[PDB]
Amino acid sequence: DPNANPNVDPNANPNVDPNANPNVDPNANPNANPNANPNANPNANPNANPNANPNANPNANPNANPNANPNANPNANPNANPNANPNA
Amino acid sequence: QVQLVESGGGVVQPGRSLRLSCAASGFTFRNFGMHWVRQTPGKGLEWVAVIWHDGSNKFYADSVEGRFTISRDNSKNMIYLQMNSLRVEDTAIYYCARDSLFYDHDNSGYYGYWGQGTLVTVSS
Amino acid sequence: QVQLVESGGGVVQPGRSLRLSCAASGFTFRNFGMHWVRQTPGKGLEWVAVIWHDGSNKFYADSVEGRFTISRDNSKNMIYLQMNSLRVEDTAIYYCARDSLFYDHDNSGYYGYWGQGTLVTVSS
Amino acid sequence: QVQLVESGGGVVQPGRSLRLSCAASGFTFRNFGMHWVRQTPGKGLEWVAVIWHDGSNKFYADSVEGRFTISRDNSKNMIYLQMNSLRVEDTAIYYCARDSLFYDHDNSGYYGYWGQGTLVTVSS
Amino acid sequence: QVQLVESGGGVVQPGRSLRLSCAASGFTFRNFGMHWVRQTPGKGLEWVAVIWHDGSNKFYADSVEGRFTISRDNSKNMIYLQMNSLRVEDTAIYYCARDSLFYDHDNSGYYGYWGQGTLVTVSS
Amino acid sequence: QVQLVESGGGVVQPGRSLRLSCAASGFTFRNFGMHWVRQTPGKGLEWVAVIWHDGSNKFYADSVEGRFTISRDNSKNMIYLQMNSLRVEDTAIYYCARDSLFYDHDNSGYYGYWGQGTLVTVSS
Amino acid sequence: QVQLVESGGGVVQPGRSLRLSCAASGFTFRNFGMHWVRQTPGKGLEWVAVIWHDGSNKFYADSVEGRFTISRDNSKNMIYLQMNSLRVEDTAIYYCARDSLFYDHDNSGYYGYWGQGTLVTVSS
Amino acid sequence: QVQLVESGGGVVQPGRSLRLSCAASGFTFRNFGMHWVRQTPGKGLEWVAVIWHDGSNKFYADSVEGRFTISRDNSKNMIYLQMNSLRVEDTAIYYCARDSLFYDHDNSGYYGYWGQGTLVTVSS
Amino acid sequence: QIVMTQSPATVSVSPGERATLSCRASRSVTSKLAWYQQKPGQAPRLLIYGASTRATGIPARFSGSGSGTEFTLTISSLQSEDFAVYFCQQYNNGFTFGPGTKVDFK
Amino acid sequence: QIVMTQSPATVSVSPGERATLSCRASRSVTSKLAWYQQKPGQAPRLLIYGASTRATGIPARFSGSGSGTEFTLTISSLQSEDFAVYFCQQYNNGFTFGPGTKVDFK
Amino acid sequence: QIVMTQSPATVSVSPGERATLSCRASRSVTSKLAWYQQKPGQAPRLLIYGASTRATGIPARFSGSGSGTEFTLTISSLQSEDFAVYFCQQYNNGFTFGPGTKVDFK
Amino acid sequence: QIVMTQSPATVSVSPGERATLSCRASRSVTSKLAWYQQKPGQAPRLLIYGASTRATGIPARFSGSGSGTEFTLTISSLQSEDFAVYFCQQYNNGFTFGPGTKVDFK
Amino acid sequence: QIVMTQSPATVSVSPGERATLSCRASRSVTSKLAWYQQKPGQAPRLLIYGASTRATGIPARFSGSGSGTEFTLTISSLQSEDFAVYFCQQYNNGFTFGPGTKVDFK
Amino acid sequence: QIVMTQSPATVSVSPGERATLSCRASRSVTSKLAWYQQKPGQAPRLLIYGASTRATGIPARFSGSGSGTEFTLTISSLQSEDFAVYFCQQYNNGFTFGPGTKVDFK
Amino acid sequence: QIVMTQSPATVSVSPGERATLSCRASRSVTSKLAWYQQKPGQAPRLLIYGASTRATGIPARFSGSGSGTEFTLTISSLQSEDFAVYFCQQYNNGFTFGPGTKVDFK
Amino acid sequence: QIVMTQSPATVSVSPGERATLSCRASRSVTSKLAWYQQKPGQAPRLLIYGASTRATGIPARFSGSGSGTEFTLTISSLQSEDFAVYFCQQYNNGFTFGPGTKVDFK
Amino acid sequence: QIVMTQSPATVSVSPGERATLSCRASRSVTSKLAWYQQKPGQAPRLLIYGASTRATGIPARFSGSGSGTEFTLTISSLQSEDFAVYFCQQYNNGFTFGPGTKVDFK
């Protein structure tokens, strides 16, 4: 009907309808969304987080690492240390 | 101060497509439906199309059925009318006018606020 | 104890802007829609605007169409009415009112609770 | 085996605060919405509150609007009902009820599974 | 070449538990959600469970709600289905089915690729 | 000055593997997600794959799902595309395209900047 | 028996420097982070600074940023707070508080063990 | 007393490189991220670049992408901005700005504390 | 929209008497109409909503009736605190109030 | 919201007979209505949901029917265990219960 | 939830002729309905998804149509390999299958 | 996903006039639709992104418009280097391209 | 950061009577909230941490609960030594305390 | 990203009067919008941050409010030192500034 | 940290039958969970580490599985020496054990 | 620790053709993966170290790549001397080798 | 190890202006990078060590900066006696030099 009212009815119910289904929908798409933004977010928080745990972590690996470099380090200081103890 | 400004006018050849844009300000745009009105010298005012508040239902006139497309963008407060396959009978002044001064459920379809209009000429 | 308190009133010159605030407590604010009601002595009570529960839809009276802006924030339980381009017709006491005492799907639009009202006068 | 167990009942004085807890097991807790149902002898059963699956929306009855707060924690599978400013009219048995036997989009709002209920009485 | 191979079937007694496994290859496993479909002769096909791409949400059928637990491991491309407290009604063929042929936002919930099936029988 | 150059092109037999590499310069490489876009004459432009800024998520087209593999190294500013199990349908020019002109949260997925393209021919 | 003994308190003039020392015993000092907490009558408890287990990271409140310097020395089981540019707003009792009762990865930031406290008065 | 002072200003020809430096004092430098803000007469304030607290992440504006490079030295309390391939459009006053007044996880990206700024002019 | 008029403008009734208040709409409002009580210096209060239903806490002394374009409000036994001005609202089409009818001591 | 009423309050039927319980709503609730059975000392149990659908585990003895404003619950041949108080709930608009109809010995 | 029915139970057609299978839903599922083909000893194979869209690798022989509660699957010219049992699924509300229609030799 | 069609396949305009290219999607893509221009032997160039926003460096001659399922690409007064193929992409759901439209000398 | 408010400021309770305390947060805090007890002349003592977990050595008399922006501390049978001022802390975003609520003799 | 505009370009207010500065964003910025004050030859000063919160040292004279796409900054009783140019920044999506509004003597 | 629970406390299986043990964690543990077998008078023996990896010397009879908060240990066909008490440990956050489940003759 | 796998076991490539070998890791090894070449009767020879860097004296023919869990080795134009068995090693976590892929005549 | 690259290879300038010299390393060098100046005929001279520290006797005209992978050498007002070739060294991992860049008359 071309003569139907096109304006919105302000007399519609403005309150939230409690009879809406409170159960979560199983028909929601379970696949990952490729249309999500792949760019890094510049609006993230650049400040440090004091809420991070300040306590030492006991779950760190206590075993000696075999993947440490076994070759000698040429970048060590070749100069004789003047701060070595000069006493007897 | 309901201000409606029409644009997109000019002269185009028959068989081509032109686009008209209508910017609306001074009222809640998304709560009302807008129209398009055609004024032809020697004929008078002629209705073109109507759009709903969100564009759900669109109704066109017989003289422009199947050729003209109406659309709206509530995020920009603009009304569009895409006139494809224009003919020599389409030369007239096109008016962007809002439906009714205020909301009344039993009274809708009359035009409260009109725009200055734009001229579209179809000729060779 | 549904308590509605208004603020932001005072004296302003015509053509300027005033902002009213309305703090609501004692009920789940985000589940209900709120109104603004205007009382002009010599005219009676006049409706101004209504906002949806989440602010999705906003409606305004014809006398304030395009000049008044209603807004809400559910994290602070407060209601805003932005009044721009005030005119000497706008002097009145403005009431913050909640819609309905409870939820009845077929019955909504009556003001179950009202605030004490803030007085806004525009003059030179 | 949908097993619902209420707890935290007892006797309090008017104007004080009481809290009821409901431990739910035997189903995926975070997939369904829960209710609280109150049974007053001589009046029958009356509805109190409802909470969404993820705790987004909360709806309360008129008689308990603004005084009772419903909440949930999907990690320990519990439903809580905080009762502030209790009155003599709030003496009854409170039941922890689950909405629907299974998911159906067009059919929700009935209590498919009830808890045994807990007694809450207020007096001096 | 989407290949799904189930395992972990066999014979069980009522009231015991069986764990089915599903090996997936030929596609990006972590980008899709997986289903379980059960075929009982004389009853037909019936859905059992579904899991999200990252395993955030898990949905079960009415007849298996609270007894069956679905899991996934994106680092090994494996889909699991823990079946605790089995009954004679659970004797059927269990298929590992991937959701959708390709990602479509408005079209999901059909089984694009099925596995060959595994037999689980519950009898003494 | 953003320049994208591809390499690794050539001619291979069906069923064999080819590795395309794309070099990126003129921007912060690790802040943007890169695409591979395919152009086959007679078919038009076609999308192949996408990788997140740090390579957490990778999405492939249906026609290439399970055979192609996209990766990146933010320390060398290069984008790779492993084309395993090639077929005659994969004969086309492969472009290295960057997503978006700049960061906009609600507007991403369009290819602002393209490379010159490399030719991959599958035949005997 | 976690025992914390503050020291270094007294009376100083505004704009001068005072150094507080906190002695800890009864636990492995180097495994935990330590806090400083400020109590002013009429305002309540106030957080000041936190130091990591190895002293790598230090964080301060807004009101003490750039003026108070927290430090630790694991070889003496001591916690220090250097207070430069003291103002009249800094008078309070300062508590040495250890973070957490035991190591919990997802729960840290509460003060399991408080010191006896020391009084710092700033005036003329 | 957080004081931010910058240097490295002057006059350079187009196509040449300029390096700005910014010294920070009065706060823990390594716990906050710093921005560069551009002000041009006739255009207003403009954002340029941001760096993280440890310099892990760097984000630049579209107009400066690939030409400017932000860096920081937490050991010397200095902020640097390398400006290669300068163009005439880059004539402006560059401010050293710190992000946020204090740590608020849900509120960051505003410049609470600014520096006096240096003038960089590109011309022949 | 809908024009609301109330007649008579003022009514004079002694305490303990019955008072009749009339509300008339220009067009049909079906059964969506509320009544409000406002005292000097006070905000309006909801007495009757719908067409006859009474708000919580309102005594049964207040009774409203009518439908369509003719609505009436009756105070069965007017007390001392019931002397005020009464407004009529329709919310079926828009939100319009009435001019108001005052209850005065006789 | 919606007031729910039942009639008659009590029904006396000997075991083996047929008992019919009626539920009536002030306004239409379409086909959203549940029937609950409560035995003394026990929580209510859902018998029928929707307008006719039976909860899992309910014998075919219980039969619900009706829509709109006239509902009924029929027990074709009651055993001894079918003697209790039955509540009528509507969840089309709000969540309201009926006063309760009791079935006892004849 | 939504119950799914297929009719007739068994369709007899000789190779070369057009065979039509029907599927009906208790409530409207719009245009979210998938068809599957199962041969003895084999897992079901997706033929049609949506309402008419055809899966990759499926010949243009299979043609589906319909929306709402009435759905049909049409085999334009049934070959020798098209003899199997076909299942009807709706994924608009839950995931429910039909009983299945078997196509056999004439 | 969404199939994009462009009409007409080729449009013939001499330099100086107005050229319009139309793009239509099967399902609504809101306002996520980018236009690309590809010259012979060159990679495509982004002209318009979103629905109307113009890429940096693009002259104001190229004007984009439309939303939903009907989009147009308008060239105000075509020069000589604007003769190329124009592609239509939607990135609301997946990533699909149009067949391309040729503009050629009249 | 987070503004922490406690209400009421002071509660009047007698020994053996159950006393409750309320804590409110401006924004979401989830389940990171600790309760401290400070006696006159003494340092605060950790009673509850997380949202309900009890510190070692704290009698089961003290019961905490709540999440998000509503946290409560409940003393089941308040004894003579339980008279002090109780503080509410959040450690989700920063480290902010509440003003403190004092329990006193009735 | 988000285009920010301010209105009016300039305001003329005598000392002691109330001056209102408005700000508008092209798209929704939720509640992430700050206001800066710049005096000639001086670096901008952060007055209000987020939507309304006031930086330390800012007098209660400055009052910020608004959310979504409509923001206003209100100066209740503007003093002599409050004559400057005020900038509106959003940091919800990117980091963009408004053109700036100048407050001038009347 | 994490409280670790096992159910049931005792399982009875005849030799040759399959015995399954369950382990539940209060919070997420991911894939860091070990199973230990202790015989009377002997030290515990590591069977499974990680979530499923089997220690050297342990026969393929023992098969661990599960992730997150649900972990199961399955003995495919238990012999006579597999009668003992099985402890469940998590090392994701701290080092906590389970109470222990005993396997006994039937 | 980390289990190395290679596929296919044998590849048949004629001289002058391009040969590709694959190496896949159970968990990410970043970019620490070396390739070795062993001819019968001879010790393995280091061709590639890191992820792509070539050992000194290795012809530019041998081109490897990959990072994370997917690694490949490509021989651009295999000569007669390039017929051997190639081993994949990771040294990110421990020192584990692959089974080895043999290249033979076609 | 770490490969250093200098850009541009040669720079053209007249005495009195500012000259910029860039050094880039493949991997991070922290702050251990030295600059050397070699004129034709004699050994290079150490100008800058560390990242910015100047050797004793070097005029303040020579300015160095940068850390990590980007390094620059800037001369405030380039003079005549100092036209030479400049080398970039890293001594954090091994000892490598850059290819060297030259400053020349314009």
Author numbering:
A (entry chain I): 1 to 88
B (entry chain A), C (entry chain C), D (entry chain E), E (entry chain M), F (entry chain O), G (entry chain Q), ...: 1 to 52, 52A, 53 to 82, 82A, 82B, 82C, 83 to 100, 100A, ...
I (entry chain D), J (entry chain F), K (entry chain N), L (entry chain P), M (entry chain R), N (entry chain L), ...: 1 to 94, 96 to 107
Q: Please, what does the article write about this entry?
A:
Many malaria vaccine candidates, like RTS,S, are based on P. falciparum circumsporozoite protein (PfCSP), which is the primary surface antigen of P. falciparum sporozoites, the stage of malaria parasites infectious to humans. The structure of PfCSP comprises three domains: (1) a flexible N-terminus, which contains a heparin sulfate binding site for hepatocyte attachment; (2) a central repeat region composed of 25 to 40 major (NANP) repeats, which are interspersed by a few, N-terminal minor repeats (NVDP, NPDP); and (3) a small, structured C-terminal domain. In each complex, CSP displays some form of helical structure that is stabilized by homotypic interfaces between tightly packed Fabs bound along the length of the NPNA repeats.
Other key residues in CDRH1B are R30 and F32, which in both mAbs 239 and 356 form a signature motif R30N31F25, mutated from the germline sequence of S30S31Y25. As previously shown for 311, the tight helical packing in the complexes of mAbs 334, 337, and 356 creates a secondary homotypic interface between Fabs separated by about one helical turn (3 or 4 NPNA2 epitopes). In terms of NPNA4, the apparent affinity of 311R was essentially unchanged relative to 311, while 356R and 239R were ~two-fold higher (improved) and ~two-fold lower than 356 and 239, respectively. Strikingly, however, 311R, 239R, and 356R each showed a consistent and dramatic reduction in percent inhibition relative to their WT counterparts, which was statistically significant in each case (Mann–Whitney U test; p < 0.001). While there is a range in the level of inhibition, many antibodies are highly potent and have statistically indistinguishable protection relative to mAb 317, namely mAbs 356, 311, 334, and 364.
